[PDB]
Design a protein around this ligand. Structure first.
Ligand SMILES: *[C@@H]1O[C@H](CO)[C@@H](O)[C@H](O)[C@H]1NC(C)=O
Ligand SMILES: *[C@@H]1O[C@H](CO)[C@@H](O)[C@H](O)[C@H]1NC(C)=O
Lengths: 120, 52, 260, 52
Protein backbone atom coordinates (compact mmCIF):
# COMPACT_ATOMS: atom_id res chain seq x y z
CA UNK A 1 0.00 0.00 0.00
CA UNK A 2 1.05 3.62 -0.49
CA UNK A 3 1.01 6.07 2.41
CA UNK A 4 1.79 9.77 2.00
CA UNK A 5 3.93 11.11 4.86
CA UNK A 6 4.19 14.88 5.24
CA UNK A 7 6.51 17.11 7.22
CA UNK A 8 5.83 18.41 10.71
CA UNK A 9 3.86 21.47 11.76
CA UNK A 10 5.34 24.89 11.01
CA UNK A 11 5.22 28.14 12.99
CA UNK A 12 5.99 31.13 10.78
CA UNK A 13 6.12 34.92 10.86
CA UNK A 14 4.29 37.08 8.30
CA UNK A 15 6.36 37.84 5.22
CA UNK A 16 8.25 34.54 5.33
CA UNK A 17 7.78 31.34 3.32
CA UNK A 18 6.99 27.72 4.20
CA UNK A 19 8.01 24.56 2.34
CA UNK A 20 5.96 21.40 2.95
CA UNK A 21 6.99 18.00 1.60
CA UNK A 22 4.93 14.86 0.94
CA UNK A 23 7.02 11.67 0.84
CA UNK A 24 5.35 8.71 -0.86
CA UNK A 25 6.17 5.66 1.26
CA UNK A 26 5.47 2.02 0.53
CA UNK A 27 5.64 2.57 -3.23
CA UNK A 28 6.17 5.25 -5.83
CA UNK A 29 3.70 7.99 -6.75
CA UNK A 30 5.43 9.33 -9.87
CA UNK A 31 2.72 7.91 -12.14
CA UNK A 32 -0.09 9.64 -10.22
CA UNK A 33 -0.95 13.29 -9.67
CA UNK A 34 -0.33 14.55 -6.14
CA UNK A 35 -2.49 17.57 -5.29
CA UNK A 36 -2.09 20.07 -2.47
CA UNK A 37 -5.30 20.92 -0.62
CA UNK A 38 -5.50 23.35 2.29
CA UNK A 39 -8.23 23.72 4.91
CA UNK A 40 -8.66 26.96 6.83
CA UNK A 41 -9.94 26.64 10.42
CA UNK A 42 -13.72 26.75 10.26
CA UNK A 43 -13.72 26.84 6.44
CA UNK A 44 -13.83 24.22 3.70
CA UNK A 45 -11.17 22.52 1.60
CA UNK A 46 -9.36 24.63 -0.99
CA UNK A 47 -7.29 23.40 -3.92
CA UNK A 48 -3.86 25.00 -4.29
CA UNK A 49 -2.40 23.01 -7.17
CA UNK A 50 -0.66 19.78 -7.97
CA UNK A 51 2.15 18.14 -9.89
CA UNK A 52 2.13 15.13 -12.21
CA UNK A 53 5.87 14.56 -12.43
CA UNK A 54 6.39 11.82 -15.05
CA UNK A 55 3.48 13.22 -17.07
CA UNK A 56 5.15 16.62 -16.71
CA UNK A 57 2.13 18.67 -15.60
CA UNK A 58 2.35 21.23 -12.81
CA UNK A 59 -0.98 22.93 -12.20
CA UNK A 60 -1.79 25.81 -9.85
CA UNK A 61 -4.97 27.48 -8.66
CA UNK A 62 -5.77 30.88 -10.16
CA UNK A 63 -6.12 32.35 -6.66
CA UNK A 64 -2.72 30.84 -5.77
CA UNK A 65 -0.94 31.50 -9.10
CA UNK A 66 2.42 33.21 -8.73
CA UNK A 67 2.50 32.71 -4.95
CA UNK A 68 2.79 28.92 -4.50
CA UNK A 69 5.56 26.75 -5.96
CA UNK A 70 4.91 23.02 -6.28
CA UNK A 71 7.71 20.69 -7.35
CA UNK A 72 8.24 16.94 -7.28
CA UNK A 73 11.24 14.68 -6.81
CA UNK A 74 10.91 11.37 -8.64
CA UNK A 75 14.06 9.82 -7.19
CA UNK A 76 13.00 10.29 -3.56
CA UNK A 77 9.25 9.98 -4.40
CA UNK A 78 8.64 13.31 -2.68
CA UNK A 79 6.31 16.11 -3.76
CA UNK A 80 7.01 19.58 -2.39
CA UNK A 81 4.88 22.69 -1.92
CA UNK A 82 6.46 26.09 -1.24
CA UNK A 83 4.17 29.00 -0.34
CA UNK A 84 5.67 32.50 -0.29
CA UNK A 85 4.54 35.82 1.25
CA UNK A 86 2.72 34.37 4.24
CA UNK A 87 -0.06 36.42 5.85
CA UNK A 88 -2.63 35.58 8.52
CA UNK A 89 -5.01 34.37 5.79
CA UNK A 90 -2.54 31.56 4.99
CA UNK A 91 -3.16 29.87 8.35
CA UNK A 92 -4.65 26.49 7.41
CA UNK A 93 -4.11 22.73 7.54
CA UNK A 94 -2.28 21.62 4.41
CA UNK A 95 -2.91 18.19 2.89
CA UNK A 96 -1.11 16.35 0.13
CA UNK A 97 -3.43 14.05 -1.78
CA UNK A 98 -2.69 11.47 -4.46
CA UNK A 99 -5.20 11.17 -7.29
CA UNK A 100 -6.55 8.02 -8.90
CA UNK A 101 -4.62 8.47 -12.15
CA UNK A 102 -1.98 10.72 -13.74
CA UNK A 103 -4.19 13.83 -13.79
CA UNK A 104 -6.39 15.82 -11.46
CA UNK A 105 -9.90 14.82 -12.56
CA UNK A 106 -9.95 11.59 -10.54
CA UNK A 107 -10.80 11.32 -6.87
CA UNK A 108 -8.07 11.78 -4.27
CA UNK A 109 -8.02 8.32 -2.67
CA UNK A 110 -4.71 8.59 -0.77
CA UNK A 111 -4.21 11.54 1.58
CA UNK A 112 -1.44 12.74 3.84
CA UNK A 113 -1.89 13.26 7.56
CA UNK A 114 -1.91 17.04 7.19
CA UNK A 115 0.46 19.87 8.08
CA UNK A 116 -0.74 22.75 10.24
CA UNK A 117 0.79 26.12 9.34
CA UNK A 118 0.14 29.00 11.76
CA UNK A 119 1.22 32.52 10.80
CA UNK A 120 1.57 35.04 13.62
CA UNK B 1 48.17 -6.99 7.51
CA UNK B 2 50.76 -4.62 5.98
CA UNK B 3 49.21 -5.09 2.52
CA UNK B 4 45.78 -3.58 3.10
CA UNK B 5 45.85 -1.22 0.10
CA UNK B 6 46.58 -4.03 -2.37
CA UNK B 7 43.98 -6.22 -0.61
CA UNK B 8 41.39 -3.44 -0.89
CA UNK B 9 42.45 -2.98 -4.53
CA UNK B 10 41.89 -6.68 -5.24
CA UNK B 11 38.57 -6.72 -3.39
CA UNK B 12 37.31 -3.61 -5.18
CA UNK B 13 38.54 -4.89 -8.57
CA UNK B 14 36.82 -8.26 -8.20
CA UNK B 15 33.66 -6.71 -6.71
CA UNK B 16 33.57 -4.15 -9.52
CA UNK B 17 33.97 -6.83 -12.18
CA UNK B 18 31.20 -8.89 -10.54
CA UNK B 19 29.02 -5.76 -10.48
CA UNK B 20 29.70 -5.02 -14.17
CA UNK B 21 28.88 -8.59 -15.18
CA UNK B 22 25.79 -8.71 -12.93
CA UNK B 23 24.59 -5.49 -14.57
CA UNK B 24 25.34 -6.93 -18.01
CA UNK B 25 23.42 -10.15 -17.31
CA UNK B 26 20.43 -8.35 -15.75
CA UNK B 27 20.23 -5.71 -18.48
CA UNK B 28 20.57 -8.29 -21.26
CA UNK B 29 17.78 -10.36 -19.69
CA UNK B 30 15.50 -7.30 -19.36
CA UNK B 31 16.24 -5.98 -22.87
CA UNK B 32 15.86 -9.37 -24.55
CA UNK B 33 12.65 -10.00 -22.60
CA UNK B 34 11.27 -6.79 -24.12
CA UNK B 35 12.57 -7.85 -27.54
CA UNK B 36 11.09 -11.35 -27.16
CA UNK B 37 7.62 -10.14 -26.14
CA UNK B 38 7.63 -7.52 -28.91
CA UNK B 39 8.83 -10.24 -31.31
CA UNK B 40 5.85 -12.42 -30.39
CA UNK B 41 3.51 -9.43 -30.75
CA UNK B 42 5.03 -8.66 -34.16
CA UNK B 43 4.61 -12.31 -35.18
CA UNK B 44 0.90 -12.28 -34.29
CA UNK B 45 0.39 -8.90 -36.02
CA UNK B 46 2.40 -10.10 -39.02
CA UNK B 47 0.37 -13.31 -39.38
CA UNK B 48 -2.79 -11.19 -39.14
CA UNK B 49 -1.44 -8.85 -41.83
CA UNK B 50 -0.50 -11.82 -44.04
CA UNK B 51 -4.04 -13.23 -43.87
CA UNK B 52 -5.55 -9.74 -44.25
CA UNK C 1 27.99 21.85 -6.45
CA UNK C 2 28.37 24.91 -4.25
CA UNK C 3 32.14 24.45 -3.91
CA UNK C 4 32.53 24.20 -0.13
CA UNK C 5 33.42 21.50 2.38
CA UNK C 6 30.45 20.66 4.59
CA UNK C 7 29.70 18.46 7.57
CA UNK C 8 28.88 14.85 6.70
CA UNK C 9 25.53 14.22 8.45
CA UNK C 10 26.28 16.85 11.09
CA UNK C 11 29.87 15.79 11.90
CA UNK C 12 32.62 18.36 11.38
CA UNK C 13 35.51 17.06 9.23
CA UNK C 14 39.14 17.09 10.26
CA UNK C 15 40.65 19.82 8.09
CA UNK C 16 44.41 19.71 8.57
CA UNK C 17 44.97 22.85 6.40
CA UNK C 18 48.75 23.05 5.75
CA UNK C 19 49.48 20.05 7.98
CA UNK C 20 49.90 16.49 6.78
CA UNK C 21 48.81 13.17 8.25
CA UNK C 22 52.38 12.49 9.41
CA UNK C 23 52.73 15.94 11.00
CA UNK C 24 49.37 15.49 12.71
CA UNK C 25 50.04 12.00 14.04
CA UNK C 26 53.63 12.74 15.06
CA UNK C 27 52.70 16.12 16.53
CA UNK C 28 54.32 18.82 14.41
CA UNK C 29 55.02 22.09 16.29
CA UNK C 30 53.31 23.91 13.40
CA UNK C 31 50.18 21.77 13.94
CA UNK C 32 49.39 22.62 17.57
CA UNK C 33 45.82 23.49 16.55
CA UNK C 34 45.23 19.74 16.22
CA UNK C 35 46.66 18.55 19.57
CA UNK C 36 43.15 17.68 20.83
CA UNK C 37 40.87 16.68 17.95
CA UNK C 38 37.16 15.79 18.27
CA UNK C 39 35.35 13.14 16.25
CA UNK C 40 35.56 13.71 12.49
CA UNK C 41 33.68 12.33 9.51
CA UNK C 42 36.45 12.69 6.92
CA UNK C 43 40.00 14.02 6.84
CA UNK C 44 40.90 16.94 4.57
CA UNK C 45 44.53 17.26 3.51
CA UNK C 46 46.14 19.61 1.03
CA UNK C 47 47.72 18.28 -2.16
CA UNK C 48 51.16 19.54 -1.08
CA UNK C 49 50.90 20.38 2.63
CA UNK C 50 53.69 22.55 3.98
CA UNK C 51 53.71 21.08 7.51
CA UNK C 52 54.93 17.57 6.75
CA UNK C 53 57.69 15.85 8.73
CA UNK C 54 59.68 18.89 9.86
CA UNK C 55 62.84 16.91 10.48
CA UNK C 56 63.85 15.15 7.25
CA UNK C 57 63.21 11.45 6.98
CA UNK C 58 60.21 9.21 6.44
CA UNK C 59 57.33 7.48 8.16
CA UNK C 60 57.53 3.78 7.31
CA UNK C 61 54.29 2.39 5.82
CA UNK C 62 52.84 5.90 5.70
CA UNK C 63 50.30 4.91 3.06
CA UNK C 64 49.24 1.84 5.05
CA UNK C 65 48.66 4.18 8.01
CA UNK C 66 46.65 6.50 5.76
CA UNK C 67 44.66 3.48 4.60
CA UNK C 68 43.86 2.65 8.23
CA UNK C 69 42.74 6.25 8.77
CA UNK C 70 39.96 5.74 6.23
CA UNK C 71 38.41 3.40 8.83
CA UNK C 72 38.92 5.58 11.94
CA UNK C 73 36.55 8.39 12.92
CA UNK C 74 37.98 9.39 16.30
CA UNK C 75 41.28 9.31 18.16
CA UNK C 76 41.59 9.93 21.89
CA UNK C 77 45.25 10.67 22.57
CA UNK C 78 46.77 9.32 25.79
CA UNK C 79 50.23 9.69 27.31
CA UNK C 80 51.44 6.09 27.36
CA UNK C 81 54.98 7.04 28.47
CA UNK C 82 55.39 10.34 30.35
CA UNK C 83 58.62 12.32 30.10
CA UNK C 84 59.27 11.57 33.80
CA UNK C 85 59.83 7.91 32.80
CA UNK C 86 63.31 8.79 31.43
CA UNK C 87 65.38 9.83 34.47
CA UNK C 88 68.72 8.78 32.97
CA UNK C 89 68.19 10.37 29.54
CA UNK C 90 67.89 14.00 28.46
CA UNK C 91 64.33 14.66 27.28
CA UNK C 92 64.80 18.43 26.88
CA UNK C 93 67.82 18.82 24.58
CA UNK C 94 66.31 16.88 21.67
CA UNK C 95 65.37 19.86 19.49
CA UNK C 96 66.28 21.00 15.99
CA UNK C 97 65.94 24.09 13.82
CA UNK C 98 64.12 22.05 11.15
CA UNK C 99 61.13 21.96 13.55
CA UNK C 100 60.80 25.59 14.67
CA UNK C 101 58.23 26.80 17.18
CA UNK C 102 57.81 30.61 17.22
CA UNK C 103 61.35 31.08 15.92
CA UNK C 104 62.95 28.78 18.52
CA UNK C 105 64.08 25.21 17.74
CA UNK C 106 61.69 22.49 18.88
CA UNK C 107 60.68 18.93 18.02
CA UNK C 108 57.67 16.67 17.47
CA UNK C 109 55.39 16.60 20.50
CA UNK C 110 54.03 13.05 20.31
CA UNK C 111 57.56 11.56 20.44
CA UNK C 112 60.67 12.32 22.49
CA UNK C 113 64.18 12.60 21.09
CA UNK C 114 66.33 11.11 23.86
CA UNK C 115 69.81 12.59 24.15
CA UNK C 116 72.54 11.25 26.45
CA UNK C 117 72.46 12.46 30.05
CA UNK C 118 75.57 12.90 32.24
CA UNK C 119 77.67 11.90 29.19
CA UNK C 120 76.09 8.44 29.23
CA UNK C 121 73.28 6.50 27.56
CA UNK C 122 72.09 3.43 29.48
CA UNK C 123 70.18 0.79 27.56
CA UNK C 124 66.46 1.56 27.51
CA UNK C 125 64.32 -1.44 28.52
CA UNK C 126 60.76 -0.13 28.75
CA UNK C 127 57.37 -1.76 28.18
CA UNK C 128 53.75 -0.65 27.94
CA UNK C 129 50.84 -3.03 28.50
CA UNK C 130 47.66 -2.04 26.65
CA UNK C 131 45.20 -2.08 29.54
CA UNK C 132 42.58 -0.26 27.45
CA UNK C 133 39.69 -1.98 25.68
CA UNK C 134 40.54 -0.72 22.18
CA UNK C 135 43.48 -0.65 19.79
CA UNK C 136 46.41 1.71 20.29
CA UNK C 137 48.40 3.45 17.55
CA UNK C 138 51.98 3.87 18.79
CA UNK C 139 54.50 5.92 16.80
CA UNK C 140 58.24 5.80 17.46
CA UNK C 141 61.34 6.43 15.39
CA UNK C 142 65.06 6.09 14.77
CA UNK C 143 67.53 8.92 14.20
CA UNK C 144 70.09 8.33 11.45
CA UNK C 145 73.09 10.46 12.36
CA UNK C 146 75.52 12.18 10.00
CA UNK C 147 78.90 10.97 11.27
CA UNK C 148 80.52 9.19 14.21
CA UNK C 149 81.21 12.58 15.83
CA UNK C 150 77.45 13.25 15.91
CA UNK C 151 76.86 9.71 17.18
CA UNK C 152 79.23 10.18 20.12
CA UNK C 153 77.98 13.75 20.66
CA UNK C 154 74.30 12.75 20.90
CA UNK C 155 74.22 9.16 22.19
CA UNK C 156 77.80 8.25 23.37
CA UNK C 157 77.47 4.77 21.80
CA UNK C 158 78.98 4.29 18.32
CA UNK C 159 76.97 1.19 17.36
CA UNK C 160 73.36 1.43 18.54
CA UNK C 161 70.19 -0.56 17.91
CA UNK C 162 66.44 -0.30 18.38
CA UNK C 163 64.44 -3.40 19.32
CA UNK C 164 60.64 -3.18 19.22
CA UNK C 165 58.61 -6.26 20.08
CA UNK C 166 54.88 -6.96 20.34
CA UNK C 167 52.65 -10.00 19.87
CA UNK C 168 52.94 -9.68 16.07
CA UNK C 169 55.83 -7.21 15.64
CA UNK C 170 59.52 -8.16 15.71
CA UNK C 171 61.76 -5.22 14.82
CA UNK C 172 65.51 -4.68 14.91
CA UNK C 173 66.99 -1.43 13.64
CA UNK C 174 70.35 0.28 13.35
CA UNK C 175 71.14 3.87 12.31
CA UNK C 176 72.40 4.46 8.78
CA UNK C 177 75.27 6.79 9.66
CA UNK C 178 76.07 8.25 6.24
CA UNK C 179 76.33 11.49 4.28
CA UNK C 180 73.06 12.85 2.92
CA UNK C 181 72.27 16.18 1.33
CA UNK C 182 70.63 18.96 3.31
CA UNK C 183 66.85 18.64 3.45
CA UNK C 184 65.16 21.37 5.55
CA UNK C 185 68.58 22.53 6.76
CA UNK C 186 69.49 19.21 8.40
CA UNK C 187 71.80 16.49 7.14
CA UNK C 188 70.49 13.76 9.46
CA UNK C 189 67.36 11.70 8.90
CA UNK C 190 64.56 10.23 11.02
CA UNK C 191 62.71 7.06 10.04
CA UNK C 192 59.43 6.82 11.94
CA UNK C 193 57.53 3.60 12.56
CA UNK C 194 54.04 2.70 13.74
CA UNK C 195 52.09 -0.30 14.97
CA UNK C 196 48.60 -1.11 16.22
CA UNK C 197 48.74 -2.51 19.75
CA UNK C 198 45.90 -4.89 20.55
CA UNK C 199 44.16 -4.91 23.95
CA UNK C 200 45.82 -7.09 26.62
CA UNK C 201 49.03 -6.94 24.58
CA UNK C 202 52.32 -5.28 25.46
CA UNK C 203 54.86 -3.40 23.36
CA UNK C 204 58.51 -3.61 24.40
CA UNK C 205 61.14 -1.03 23.46
CA UNK C 206 64.87 -1.67 23.67
CA UNK C 207 67.60 0.71 22.53
CA UNK C 208 71.00 2.07 23.53
CA UNK C 209 70.87 5.10 21.23
CA UNK C 210 69.16 6.84 18.30
CA UNK C 211 65.74 6.35 19.92
CA UNK C 212 62.89 8.74 19.12
CA UNK C 213 60.85 7.40 22.04
CA UNK C 214 57.03 7.54 22.05
CA UNK C 215 55.24 9.72 24.57
CA UNK C 216 51.67 10.07 23.27
CA UNK C 217 49.81 7.24 21.56
CA UNK C 218 46.32 7.26 20.07
CA UNK C 219 43.39 5.14 21.26
CA UNK C 220 41.25 4.09 18.31
CA UNK C 221 37.93 4.82 20.01
CA UNK C 222 35.65 4.81 16.95
CA UNK C 223 35.67 2.91 13.66
CA UNK C 224 33.52 3.59 10.63
CA UNK C 225 33.37 5.05 7.15
CA UNK C 226 35.99 7.73 6.53
CA UNK C 227 38.36 9.00 3.86
CA UNK C 228 41.36 11.27 3.42
CA UNK C 229 40.37 14.07 1.06
CA UNK C 230 42.89 15.91 -1.12
CA UNK C 231 41.25 19.33 -1.29
CA UNK C 232 42.25 22.98 -1.17
CA UNK C 233 38.62 24.07 -0.73
CA UNK C 234 37.85 26.06 2.41
CA UNK C 235 35.31 25.06 5.06
CA UNK C 236 31.78 26.25 4.40
CA UNK C 237 29.98 25.88 7.78
CA UNK C 238 27.33 23.63 6.28
CA UNK C 239 25.90 20.11 6.41
CA UNK C 240 25.49 17.60 3.59
CA UNK C 241 24.99 13.94 2.73
CA UNK C 242 27.46 13.73 -0.20
CA UNK C 243 30.91 15.33 -0.29
CA UNK C 244 33.53 15.67 -3.05
CA UNK C 245 36.99 17.30 -2.83
CA UNK C 246 35.75 20.18 -5.02
CA UNK C 247 32.44 20.71 -3.19
CA UNK C 248 29.49 18.95 -1.58
CA UNK C 249 26.46 17.68 -3.49
CA UNK C 250 22.95 18.30 -2.15
CA UNK C 251 20.67 16.51 -4.61
CA UNK C 252 18.85 13.22 -5.11
CA UNK C 253 20.04 12.57 -8.68
CA UNK C 254 21.11 9.03 -9.64
CA UNK C 255 24.27 10.40 -11.30
CA UNK C 256 26.82 13.19 -11.00
CA UNK C 257 29.91 14.30 -12.91
CA UNK C 258 31.53 16.30 -10.13
CA UNK C 259 34.45 14.21 -8.85
CA UNK C 260 35.35 10.49 -8.83
CA UNK D 1 77.39 -18.23 19.91
CA UNK D 2 76.18 -14.70 20.74
CA UNK D 3 76.22 -13.30 17.19
CA UNK D 4 74.95 -15.86 14.69
CA UNK D 5 73.86 -15.77 11.06
CA UNK D 6 72.09 -17.90 8.47
CA UNK D 7 73.36 -17.87 4.88
CA UNK D 8 71.20 -19.51 2.20
CA UNK D 9 72.32 -19.47 -1.42
CA UNK D 10 71.00 -20.92 -4.68
CA UNK D 11 71.15 -19.98 -8.35
CA UNK D 12 68.57 -17.24 -7.76
CA UNK D 13 68.45 -16.82 -3.95
CA UNK D 14 71.02 -14.86 -1.94
CA UNK D 15 69.98 -14.65 1.70
CA UNK D 16 71.75 -13.61 4.89
CA UNK D 17 69.96 -13.39 8.22
CA UNK D 18 70.62 -12.66 11.89
CA UNK D 19 68.39 -13.33 14.91
CA UNK D 20 66.40 -10.43 16.32
CA UNK D 21 67.22 -11.03 19.98
CA UNK D 22 64.66 -8.85 21.75
CA UNK D 23 61.98 -8.77 24.41
CA UNK D 24 58.48 -9.35 23.05
CA UNK D 25 55.02 -10.45 24.13
CA UNK D 26 54.03 -14.03 24.91
CA UNK D 27 52.36 -15.81 22.00
CA UNK D 28 51.46 -19.47 22.72
CA UNK D 29 53.49 -19.32 25.93
CA UNK D 30 56.76 -18.40 24.17
CA UNK D 31 58.63 -15.11 23.85
CA UNK D 32 60.81 -16.47 21.06
CA UNK D 33 59.96 -16.27 17.37
CA UNK D 34 60.64 -18.40 14.31
CA UNK D 35 60.73 -16.75 10.89
CA UNK D 36 60.37 -19.50 8.30
CA UNK D 37 61.55 -19.14 4.71
CA UNK D 38 60.89 -21.11 1.55
CA UNK D 39 62.33 -21.41 -1.94
CA UNK D 40 61.75 -23.40 -5.13
CA UNK D 41 64.87 -25.35 -6.11
CA UNK D 42 65.21 -25.91 -9.85
CA UNK D 43 66.55 -29.22 -11.21
CA UNK D 44 70.35 -29.44 -11.58
CA UNK D 45 70.64 -26.60 -9.05
CA UNK D 46 71.96 -26.78 -5.50
CA UNK D 47 70.94 -25.04 -2.29
CA UNK D 48 73.68 -24.15 0.19
CA UNK D 49 73.08 -23.56 3.90
CA UNK D 50 75.54 -21.82 6.20
CA UNK D 51 74.93 -21.00 9.85
CA UNK D 52 76.65 -20.97 13.23
C1 LIG E 1 23.02 21.94 0.71
O1 LIG E 1 21.62 22.02 0.49
C2 LIG E 1 21.07 23.29 0.77
C3 LIG E 1 19.56 23.20 0.69
O2 LIG E 1 18.99 24.42 1.11
C4 LIG E 1 21.67 24.35 -0.17
O3 LIG E 1 21.26 25.65 0.17
C5 LIG E 1 23.20 24.32 -0.08
O4 LIG E 1 23.81 25.14 -1.04
C6 LIG E 1 23.76 22.90 -0.25
N1 LIG E 1 25.18 22.89 -0.03
C7 LIG E 1 26.08 22.56 -0.97
C8 LIG E 1 27.52 22.62 -0.52
O5 LIG E 1 25.78 22.24 -2.11
C1 LIG F 1 49.67 -7.47 29.95
O1 LIG F 1 48.72 -7.53 30.99
C2 LIG F 1 47.90 -8.68 31.04
C3 LIG F 1 46.82 -8.45 32.08
O2 LIG F 1 47.26 -7.49 33.01
C4 LIG F 1 48.79 -9.89 31.32
O3 LIG F 1 48.06 -11.09 31.32
C5 LIG F 1 49.82 -9.99 30.20
O4 LIG F 1 50.75 -11.01 30.44
C6 LIG F 1 50.61 -8.69 30.00
N1 LIG F 1 51.40 -8.79 28.79
C7 LIG F 1 52.74 -8.88 28.70
C8 LIG F 1 53.52 -8.87 30.00
O5 LIG F 1 53.32 -8.96 27.63
Amino acid sequence: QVQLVQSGAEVKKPGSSVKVSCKSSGGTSNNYAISWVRQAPGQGLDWMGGISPIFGSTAYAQKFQGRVTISADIFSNTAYMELNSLTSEDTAVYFCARHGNYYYYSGMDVWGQGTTVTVS
Amino acid sequence: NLERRIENLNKKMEDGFLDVWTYNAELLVLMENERTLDFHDSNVKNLYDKVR
Amino acid sequence: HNGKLCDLNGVKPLILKDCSVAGWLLGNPMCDEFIRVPEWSYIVERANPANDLCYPGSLNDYEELKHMLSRINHFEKIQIIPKSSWPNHETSLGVSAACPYQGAPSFFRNVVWLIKKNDAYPTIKISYNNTNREDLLILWGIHHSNNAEEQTNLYKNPITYISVGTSTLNQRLAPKIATRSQVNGQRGRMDFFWTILKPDDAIHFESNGNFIAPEYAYKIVKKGDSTIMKSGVEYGHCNTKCQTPVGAINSSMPFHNIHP
